[PDB]
Amino acid sequence: FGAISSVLNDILSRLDPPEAEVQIDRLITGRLQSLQTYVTQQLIRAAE
């Protein structure tokens, strides 16, 4: 999603918190958006 590496322990180990926060926050934005997408698909499919 625009991060360094898609592994959280990898980001946290490679970088210091002052930048791990940014890389993480990008991972969080992406994964949260993916969860929202999945939950909305489930909502519509459950309505059907």
Binding site: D16, P17, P18, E19, E21
Partner: protein, 48 residues
């Protein structure tokens, strides 16, 4: 135009080649074993 509960004045002297360490999210000898500002530091760093 801003009120504050308590304002702190931390005082010390350093070299111009070390001012960058007296700031949030830095690294170095000072920001390691001497004096470290928080990650969410809310204030100004002043020197003359």
């Amino acid at each position: 135009d801003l009120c504050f509960t308590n304002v702190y004045a931390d005082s010390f002297v350093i070299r111009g080649d070390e001012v960058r360490q007296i700031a949030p999210g830095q690294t170095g000898k000072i920001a390691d074993y001497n004096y470290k500002l928080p990650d969410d530091f809310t204030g100004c760093v002043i020197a003359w």
